[PDB]
């Protein structure tokens, strides 16, 4: 089944991806990750999100939209995959039509906007992997280590409280209407819409998911 997260920075959509991903084997392709590795090792493509990521704007439709195509191709998007964090606008919507990737499930993670700030400021993630962590809400079962490696938990540079000010913004101008849009693909048949409240502990966020998947 091919999914798509969608939901503003800090819904835990990273975190509940794992899961999925652990649970029904489908791959997670997610394009924060994919940049931030770009600029870190130097990539001809998406090495350019770099300062865009640091202003916390949103990177080019037309940049993002090659990253996405040049991973479904890559040995995997057979089992089908998870888009944890696209499409991010309506452009990148309109670019799954007019490239043929449709969709069987687009869940919401609906989590109020005075939470944000706090779940950003406590996020330590493991990059080789994806793991996600919180210091105070998930924190690691040993103290700033991962759990399947024992390797050193960094947090990403933009992850600044000012930063994710701007993201929201540009989220609540950008990406929110995706709502709105899913909302109609469903009523044509094209895919379920589902919103889950991301608020609720971990576990139980996880729970809900099953069951509205199986
Ligand atoms: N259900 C939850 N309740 C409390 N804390 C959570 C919950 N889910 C995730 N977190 C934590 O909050 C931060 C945001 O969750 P994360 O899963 O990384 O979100 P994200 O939606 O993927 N954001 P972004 O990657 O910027 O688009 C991480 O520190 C998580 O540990
Ligand atoms: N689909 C996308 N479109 C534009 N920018 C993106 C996109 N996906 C990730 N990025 C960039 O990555 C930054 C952090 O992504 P994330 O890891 O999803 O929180 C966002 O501020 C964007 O700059």
């Given at each position: 089944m091919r999914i798509i997260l969608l939901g503003a920075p800090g819904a835990g959509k990273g975190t509940q991806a794992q899961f999925i991903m652990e649970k029904y084997?489908?791959?997670?392709?997610?394009?924060?990750?994919?940049?931030?590795?770009?600029?870190?090792?130097?990539?001809?493509?998406?090495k350019q999100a770099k300062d865009i990521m640091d202003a916390g704007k949103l990177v080019t439709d037309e940049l993002v939209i090659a990253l996405v195509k040049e991973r479904i191709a890559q040995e995997d998007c057979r089992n089908g995959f998870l888009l944890d964090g696209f499409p991010r606008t309506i452009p990148q919507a309109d670019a799954m039509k007019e490239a043929g990737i449709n969709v069987d499930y687009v869940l919401e993670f609906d989590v109020p906007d005075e939470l944000i700030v706090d779940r950003i400021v406590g996020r330590r993630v493991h990059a080789p992997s994806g793991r996600v962590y919180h210091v105070k809400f998930?924190?690691?079962?040993?103290?700033?280590?991962?759990?399947?490696?024992?390797?050193e938990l960094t947090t990403r540079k933009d992850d600044q409280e000012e930063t994710v000010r701007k993201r929201l913004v540009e989220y609540h101008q950008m990406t929110a209407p995706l709502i709105g849009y899913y909302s109609k693909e469903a009523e044509a048949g094209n895919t379920k819409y589902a919103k889950v409240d991301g608020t609720k502990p971990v576990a139980e966020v996880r729970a809900d998911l099953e069951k509205i998947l199986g």
């Open positions: 084997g489908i791959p997670q392709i997610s394009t924060g990750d994919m940049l931030r590795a770009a600029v870190k090792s130097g990539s001809e493509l998406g998930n924190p690691p079962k040993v103290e700033g280590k991962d759990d399947v490696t024992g390797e």
